[PDB]
Design a protein around this nucleic acid. Structure first.
Lengths: 141, 67, 143, 80, 145, 63, 100, 112, 45, 67
RNA sequence: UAAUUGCGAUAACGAACGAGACCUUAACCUACUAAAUAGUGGUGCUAGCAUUUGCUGGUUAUCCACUUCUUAGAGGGACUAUCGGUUUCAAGCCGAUGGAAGUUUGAGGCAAUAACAGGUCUGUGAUGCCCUUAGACGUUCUGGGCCGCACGCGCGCUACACUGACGGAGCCAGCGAGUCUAACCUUGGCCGAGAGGUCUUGGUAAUCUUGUGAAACUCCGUCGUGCUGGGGAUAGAGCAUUGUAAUUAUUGCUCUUCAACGAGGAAUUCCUAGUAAGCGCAAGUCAUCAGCUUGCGUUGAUUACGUCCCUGCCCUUUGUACACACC
RNA sequence: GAUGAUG
């Protein structure tokens, strides 16, 4: 069977399932090329994993991602983390250890979110206010 | 704060006076002994009890401790 | 290599296709285009009184492509907007059923869409040929 | 008719159910027994059974116009 | 995308229905000064009258202006849907009309007079100058005069 | 006018009625071995370099 | 004979005793089945003011009741289904069976 | 920020980031004051200002000055910040940031 | 009678006011709190 | 001003090229013409090569003098 | 120390409630047991574009296998473990690496003794007393009112515009709910500018509504510092829905009218991170009507890591003519 | 070591 691997990443309610297999450098998000990701301004976030390591490492692989949930911003953080994790899980199974360590070093030294999810989660609202810690205005006269 | 309560200080104290030879300077091993040596009602309390015991073995290594 | 509609930005594709339909002139225009406003939430009629209809047809043609089936309801939701309501706050208000219906009727006649079981419209064989030919044209014009 | 059946079963450990003893007070107080005699009667019966703590509170117009609360207890009880 | 010169025949103001209308304002929103012409009535009138909306109010030729006035004064005559008009099924004639210029205020004084002589609740309320549409007056609308 | 620079070598505890000031000991970058006690407005640690407008003042304290 | 065995309750421990009894009972007969498919729990809610008269600081209270639906598919003869429906009566658990 | 930087390198032919770092380093007030008193009567006192706080207050003055300019003014936000940053690094009194740095220092000196 | 406040009443105290109708309980708010333990509504969080 | 006459038109063609930075606002305050006309002027001068764009963005236009 | 939490001291010794423990909920597991009412891959049939073994899709009556993403059941995990500082050097405090997680890991539920002449006899077929008991204060029926407006107040929603308004395109959540003594959530086709109408259909529910295609948001254009295309209050005219019945317009649609408001005096309220603040959706209420409340997600800063100046809390010492207790 | 009456 064709060599392959699976990984994922999260931020808030966003989840991106990245499927990797030996190939010719295809990289696609939601069936469209990575280049067409939106919103436009945050596109270099999706590119970030490819540049920080070198486009050479991606020439012999195909990556297809599918993202659901969350919002227009948290998704882009899911996508970049699925690409970073997928590449390091592929080197985990089909390439030597020394390469895996070096690749993790490039990502960690730059932005921990490319590998490890963000721990922040929201807090419940409490009665007596409009939000988690805010409260309604009080009056004495 | 990281101040333990008396239900932890005393439980660890009882273990050392009855099981010094078997305890070690290692949390993980002491975690498993407390399951075979004392009946505790939670995973949380069991971790805390064993953790203090490790801390006390370190003290006894450098010299005897009052109490 | 080949090309699919998903290989070209949505804004680029929609502009290119709206021009094409306008030029060929084989799409039906319901006639009251110059009067109505595309959703109750709006407070003025569309600005481009010339080519706003051919623009709507360009979007819906692509929207069927991406998905399996759609309907008048899905399109009322898709193109709905936020009502003002003045002093009182906003709320989502669905779009205009008449427009989104007569665009779907019009598309079948020119042959881009066909009805499908389970209800709702569906991209036809012909529609795929129409939308993909143009796609290669937009990419070729990257100069 | 004939699908629903009613059975009776004598309880286990009569002296350890709050509903049972609470009723016992109600009928004694309706009879005319003094408040203190009755309240400590339930406490004594509950404890000798084996209960690890009992509490009884009787609040109302016990002796005069103003109301108040009385407490009777034995053993130890937890609250949290 | 192009820019062109313009001859000095531009007239800064112009009198339509006896109400001056600014010239430095696009025609779509410049005709709103005439009472009874709102934003969407002008938006429709210009296009039914084949006027380049992109040109300013004073860039319209005289023949164009007379075209707008005629179309606007009998809107149904040029197929302006009946429901655009501001008066429909007139209580005294049965015809549909769109009120312009001074006829707006005059007709309003008419309706309030009709209710007052009828002595119906609405008429009494206006005579007293209070809110008519059922709003609570306990805590609102105090320093109105 | 000129400016002079010194370096914090200790924090001597908060001052001010509402706690908004910090007492610090500084060490002149040039002609070192001169140290003055003065006050700061915001968060301050050791090794921070300050820009004293004037040098010869020394700061009062609550004690 | 194809069957679906939907189970439900408001207390898991009992629901587990009855369900686990079902799989062990069938597996000793070496029937073919789809293991217990555990559906998401559904949680009910009732939020109401604590006060019974409308005075005092505004304070609200929330309640909950939980449902633990399962279902198991079997393929067995009739003579064995007859008793399968009659076994495993446990208070607090409701069981329903659909044939074909 | 994208528009503002592009503007800065058009107007000056110097690295736009360098302008930001220069403007900040020229705006942080070195000397400030606090209220000191007892019983209710209150008088200011002269104090120094920490490194971290010079940056924090520097940015505040820069964005506050740019924002107030953009209000009811034809110039779009991206520009008002561009001209605020250019002047401040120039050490020019026309900048709103530098005006306020001098005002605070002057009051700080009178209360020594 | 076919609708309105008066078409309904608490199944325990016939009170018209406060009735809670979610899940078809049809019990008034004061009565729900007393009976919650027996009905199966417990207090957790 | 809105309607541009030859006096106000030739003025644009003779003074724009020396500007360090030109945009929608710059042309509205250096020479009095509304923002709307400032836009069509920008999209005209560009076509004739007298100004070079740095970046084009819907709500912000950035150009410079041509080289 | 968050703590009457502990180290200890010691005419006291040994105990009990409170705090902690505890329970719920959120964050991790490529480890266990499973799962078309959840997903993924392979193969059959198959559309479109290139064609060398390619890219994107469709197919619920075609099948097979699997469990990273999804549901749970049962478990594992964090104990400040390990390391370096610091204190009679004991409880601990400071920092660092590792780790999903190192402010009690975040958020809650529960929660002591003694009181208040706090709120409720308008929740109760819970009650003492007094009143009333048939031209009733009982029960019900029709018609009004709780909405009445010279003014003063407390919670609030729209705004005072270019960090924008408007018009086309782009296009993404989670918590929930839904038909018996019965009509509920509603897809889809058709009709109408809109509201809405009409014929069918799915769902008593991880199956359908529902990817709840939500709003802010992004992109491209119209507008151009002008009470202005900001704001839509106040009024007129018609068209519809729910209900026996809407007039003192229930609400919704359509055109016309287009006022106060140019950032707000003394005063004063909330808030230390996925928090404030911005934006909307489900639920309660409901035949009809959110500017309310309970939750939910989405975008996501600045400024402390302190103090006893103001307002108050806890412990000791001290004075008192206070005991209704500094009013 | 500003001012601070009263029920």
């Amino acid at each position: 069977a064709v060599p392959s691997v699976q990984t994922f990443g999260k931020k808030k309610s966003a989840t991106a399932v990245a499927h990797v297999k030996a190939g010719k450098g295809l990289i696609k998000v939601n069936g469209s090329p990575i280049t067409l990701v939106e919103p436009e301004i945050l596109r270099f976030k999706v590119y970030e994993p490819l540049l920080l390591v070198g486009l050479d490492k991606f020439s012999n692989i195909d990556i297809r991602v599918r993202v659901t949930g969350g919002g227009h911003v948290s998704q882009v953080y899911a996508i970049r983390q699925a690409i970073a994790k997928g590449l390091v899980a592929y080197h985990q199974k089909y390439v030597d250890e020394q390469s895996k360590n070096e690749l993790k070093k490039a990502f960690t030294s730059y932005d921990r979110t490319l590998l490890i999810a963000d721990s922040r989660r929201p807090e419940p609202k409490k009665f007596g206010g409009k939000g988690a810690r805010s409260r309604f205005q009080k009056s004495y006269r | 704060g990281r101040v333990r309560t008396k239900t932890v200080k005393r439980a660890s104290k009882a273990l050392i006076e009855r099981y010094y030879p078997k305890l070690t300077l290692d949390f993980q091993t002491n975690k498993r002994l407390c399951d075979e040596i004392a009946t505790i009602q939670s995973k949380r309390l069991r971790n805390k009890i064993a953790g203090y015991t490790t801390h006390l073995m370190k003290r006894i290594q450098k010299g005897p401790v009052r109490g | 290599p080949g090309v699919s509609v998903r290989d070209v930005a949505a804004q680029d594709f929609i502009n290119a296709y709206a021009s094409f339909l306008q030029r060929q002139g084989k799409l039906e225009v319901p006639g009251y285009v110059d009067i109505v406003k595309t959703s109750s939430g709006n407070e003025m009629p569309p600005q481009d009184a010339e080519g706003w209809f051919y623009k709507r047809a360009a979007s819906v043609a692509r929207h069927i492509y991406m998905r399996k089936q759609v309907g008048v309801g899905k399109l009322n939701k898709l193109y709905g907007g936020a009502k003002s309501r003045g002093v009182r706050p906003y709320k989502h208000i669905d779009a205009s059923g008449s427009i989104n219906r007569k665009v779907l009727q019009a598309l079948e006649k020119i042959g881009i869409v066909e009805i499908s079981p389970k209800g709702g419209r569906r991209i036809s064989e012909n529609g795929q040929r129409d939308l993909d030919r143009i796609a290669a044209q937009t990419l070729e014009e990257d100069e | 008719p004939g699908t629903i059946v009613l059975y009776a079963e004598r309880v286990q450990d009569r002296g350890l159910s709050a509903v049972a003893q609470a009723e016992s007070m109600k009928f004694k107080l309706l009879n005319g027994l003094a408040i203190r005699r009755a309240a400590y009667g339930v406490v004594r019966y509950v404890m000798e059974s084996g209960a690890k703590g009992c509490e009884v509170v009787v609040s109302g117009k016990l002796r005069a116009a103003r109301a108040k609360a009385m407490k009777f207890a034995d053993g130890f009880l937890i609250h949290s | 995308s192009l820019v062109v010169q313009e001859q000095g025949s531009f007239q800064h103001i112009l009198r339509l229905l006896n109400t001056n209308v600014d010239g430095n304002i696009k025609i779509v929103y410049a005709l709103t000064t005439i009472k009874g012409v709102g934003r969407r009535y002008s938006n429709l009138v210009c296009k039914k009258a084949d006027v380049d909306l992109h040109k300013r109010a004073g860039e319209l030729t005289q023949e164009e202006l007379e075209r707008i006035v005629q179309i606007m004064q009998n809107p149904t005559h040029y197929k302006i849907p009946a429901w655009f008009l501001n008066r429909q099924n007139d209580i005294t004639d049965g015809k549909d009309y769109h009120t312009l210029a001074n006829n707006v205020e005059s007709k309003l004084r008419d309706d309030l007079e009709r209710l007052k002589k009828i002595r119906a609740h609405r008429g009494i309320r206006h005579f007293w100058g209070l809110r008519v549409r059922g709003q609570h007056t306990k805590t609102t609308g105090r320093r109105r005069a | 006018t000129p400016v002079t620079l010194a370096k914090v070598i200790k924090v001597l505890g908060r001052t001010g009625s509402r706690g908004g000031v910090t007492q610090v000991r500084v060490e002149f970058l040039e002609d070192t071995s001169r140290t003055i006690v003065r006050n700061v407005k915001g968060p301050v640690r050791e090794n921070d370099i300050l820009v004293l407008m004037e040098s010869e003042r020394e700061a009062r304290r609550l004690r | 004979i194809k069957i679906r065995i939907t189970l439900t309750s408001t207390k898991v421990k009992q629901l587990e005793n009855v369900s686990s009894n079902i799989v062990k009972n069938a597996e000793q007969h070496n029937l073919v089945k789809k293991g217990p498919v555990r559906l998401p729990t559904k949680v009910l809610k009732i939020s109401t003011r604590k006060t019974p008269n409308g005075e005092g600081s505004k304070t609200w209270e929330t309640y909950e009741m939980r449902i633990h639906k399962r279902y198991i598919d079997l393929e067995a003869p009739v003579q064995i289904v007859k008793r399968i429906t009659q076994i495993t009566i446990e208070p607090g658990v409701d069981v329903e069976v659909v044939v074909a | 920020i994208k528009h503002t930087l592009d503007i800065i390198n058009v107007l000056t032919d110097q690295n736009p980031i360098q302008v930001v770092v220069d403007a900040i380093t020229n705006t942080g007030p070195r000397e400030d004051t606090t209220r000191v008193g007892g019983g209710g009567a209150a008088r200011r006192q002269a104090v120094d200002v920490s490194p971290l706080r010079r940056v924090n207050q520097a940015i505040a003055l820069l964005t506050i000055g740019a924002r107030e300019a953009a209000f009811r003014n034809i110039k779009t936000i991206a520009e008002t910040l561009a001209e605020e940053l250019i002047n401040a690094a120039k050490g020019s009194s026309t900048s709103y940031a530098i005006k306020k740095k001098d005002e605070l220092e002057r009051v700080a000196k009178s209360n020594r | 009678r076919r609708y309105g406040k008066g078409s309904r009443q608490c199944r325990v105290c016939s009170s018209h006011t406060g009735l809670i109708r979610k899940y078809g309980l049809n019990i008034c708010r004061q009565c729900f709190r007393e009976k919650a333990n027996d009905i199966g509504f417990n207090k957790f969080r | 001003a809105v309607i541009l006459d030859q006096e106000k038109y030739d003025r644009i063609l003779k003074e724009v090229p020396t500007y360090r930075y030109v945009s929608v606002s710059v042309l509205v305050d250096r020479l009095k013409i509304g923002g709307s006309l400032a836009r069509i002027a920008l999209r005209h001068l560009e076509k004739e090569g007298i100004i070079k764009p740095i970046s084009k963005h819907s709500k912000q236009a950035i150009y410079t003098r041509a080289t």
